[PDB]
Amino acid sequence: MIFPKQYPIINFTTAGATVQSYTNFIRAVRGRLTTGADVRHEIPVLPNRVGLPINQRFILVELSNHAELSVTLALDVTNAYVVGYRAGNSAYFFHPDNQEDAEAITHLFTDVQNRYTFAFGGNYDRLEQLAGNLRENIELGNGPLEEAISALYYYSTGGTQLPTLARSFIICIQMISEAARFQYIEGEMRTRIRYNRRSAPDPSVITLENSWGRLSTAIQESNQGAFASPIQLQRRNGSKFSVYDVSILIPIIALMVYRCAPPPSSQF
Numbered sequence: 001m002i003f004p005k006q007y008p009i010i011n012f013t014t015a016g017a018t019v020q021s022y023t024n025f026i027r028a029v030r031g032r033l034t035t036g037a038d039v040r041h042e043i044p045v046l047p048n049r050v051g052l053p054i055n056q057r058f059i060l061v062e063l064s065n066h067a068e069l070s071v072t073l074a075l076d077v078t079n080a081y082v083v084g085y086r087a088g089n090s091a092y093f094f095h096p097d098n099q100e101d102a103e104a105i106t107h108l109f110t111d112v113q114n115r116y117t118f119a120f121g122g123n124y125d126r127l128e129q130l131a132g133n134l135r136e137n138i139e140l141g142n143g144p145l146e147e148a149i150s151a152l153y154y155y156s157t158g159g160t161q162l163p164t165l166a167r168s169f170i171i172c173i174q175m176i177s178e179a180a181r182f183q184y185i186e187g188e189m190r191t192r193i194r195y196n197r198r199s200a201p202d203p204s205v206i207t208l209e210n211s212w213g214r215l216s217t218a219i220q221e222s223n224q225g226a227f228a229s230p231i232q233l234q235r236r237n238g239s240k241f242s243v244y245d246v247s248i249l250i251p252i253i254a255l256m257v258y259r260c261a262p263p264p265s266s267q268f
Contacts, residue, residue, distance in 0.1 A: 003110060005055030007074075008032045015066040015144045019190040029180045030061050030254060031075045039267055041219060041246045042254065048258040049078045049100075054107050058083070061176065063149045070120050071152045074108050076101075079257050080177045082169065083108070083254060088156040090114035094122035099108035121222050123167065124209075130166035134173070135206055140189065174201065174209065182208055184252045207234040208252070216256040261263060 011033060012025040038045045038240055047056075068083035072086045083105060084093035092111040095118050096102040109115075120126050129132050138144075146169035155165045179186040185205055192199065201209075212235065218227045220247075230242035243249060 004107065007055070007058045007060050007108075009060040009062055009072070009106075009222060011062045013064045013066070014142055014149065015064065016144055017193060019194050022190050022193050023186070026176075026179050026186050029059070029061065029075070029176065033075070033080055033180070034255060037267070038218055038258070041222065041225060042250050043246070043253060043256050045216075045220070045258050046080060047078055052078065054104055057104055058108060063145070071107070071149050073176065075177065076104075080180055080255060082173050082177055086112055087153040090116065090156045092155065093117045095119060095120055104180060105187070115210045122173070124170065124173075126183050127166045127170055130162050131170060132163045134168065135170055135201060135209075136203075137200050138167060138170055139194035139198040139200050140174060141170060141195070143198045145152065146176055148172050148175075160216055178205075178209055179211055181255050182252060183254050184208060186254075201235045202236045202266070203238050206237045211229045212253075213259070215249065215253060217259045219249070220257060220259045222246055 010028045011023065012021065016211045034046055038047075059075045059077055061073040061075060062070055062255060063073060074083050074085065075081065076083050081151070082094075083101075084091060086092075086109045087237075089112055091112045091114070093105050093108070093116070103193050107119075118258065120130065124135060148171040151159075151161075151164050151168040152172070174185065175189055179189050185201075185208060188201065188205055191197070211231065214231060221228050225244075225246045227244055230244050232240045232242050235238060
């Protein structure tokens with residue numbers, strides 16, 4: 001009947017969004033996923049999945065449109081990714097990847113009449129085959145979120161269509177999970193919101209997204225800054241360059257996934 005703790009809700013509206021709303025929303029989202037300090041070569045690490053108790057596990061994110069229809073996205077605090085959403089009176093969850101998440105997800109919107117888990121998961125790789133379009137060709141900006149939100153909401157009432165429902169999670173994930181993971185991808189999105197542009201991510205956005213767990217291991221294993229071996233990254237035009245060091249990435253990456261552990265901390 002009622003229940004084992006409420007999760008933080010952070011709000012954003014695309015209604016009169018500016019570079020300010022957007023920034024203020026992503027720093028509130030960065031702030032609720034990291035409990036301040038497991039800070040490793042200046043970059044924060046997000047909570048380990050192992051003794052993290054269900055009531056500390058998610059964050060809820062309300063997204064509302066000009067024309068007052070809203071969606072509630074659930075983010076997993078341990079890797080900042082979208083696990084599912086609620087619109088109306090029904091809730092949709094992506095297909096979990098394991099038994100422990102299958103059951104953290106039963107805690108999530110337990111007060112909704114109707115609850116469905118997709119046969120499919122939320123990784124970009126399955127979701128691009130559903131949308132019919134690679135991330136490289138799907139446009140980002142404020143207009144794409146206004147639209148993403150109406151589409152995740154009419155999926156409830158049956159206004160449906162999978163190509164379009166998977167199109168809109170690709171956009172909600174990058175405009176939120178990914179702008180929060182990287183200071184770089186939040187600047188790409190506010191450049192689109194300042195100037196009223198909608199555009200697809202270029203190749204520096206896409207490799208950064210694909211590399212967020214490789215950079216996280218690389219940085220946790222660094223011999224106090226130096227990467228055990230170089231990571232190849234990409235420029236907006238497609239070129240490949242390597243990073244040998246954490247330095248150059250402190251302005252670029254905001255949050256890291258936990259891959260391994262300290263012994264003292266030296267950070268006080």
